[PDB]
Amino acid sequence: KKYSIGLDIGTNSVGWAVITDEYKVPSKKFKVLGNTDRHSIKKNLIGALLFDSGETAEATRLKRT
């Protein structure tokens, strides 16, 4: 049916959530490839991605000079 997506951004992380019409976090079975036994795993649709801060170009410029 209908659904909405919530986001939370920060310099190191992106908290992401997807809500539906009835304010409930959906649970869904997703297929799992590879060569393991679990071919599908029912998980939820919410989390947050972490990553290193994007670096500037000052050091490289100084080294160039």
Place this chain on the structure above:
RNA sequence: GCGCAUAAAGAUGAGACGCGUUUUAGAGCUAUGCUGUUUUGAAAAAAACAGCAUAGCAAGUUAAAAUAAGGCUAGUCCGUUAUCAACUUGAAAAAGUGGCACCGAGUCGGUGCUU
């Protein structure tokens, strides 16, 4: 929702200067002791020849090399930073790729259809 004043901030790109690092050249020395030693020889002993150890000293400032390895594009140019999930094509770019009604919830487990 701009044209604007004040006070700040950031970012970019060049041009250059102080070192520094590590090498070499800073011709450092003295005495003593050790063995091998051409050694005077048949051996001994060094001139310790070769180094070694013990102490004691003495100066000490600087000069040169490069400074990402390197690259070729031989320029007086480039090379440290953004820009990388798995995956199939596609040279690359780029594209596609994994279901869902429902019940629970320990790194999730099922479930109707059903991959």
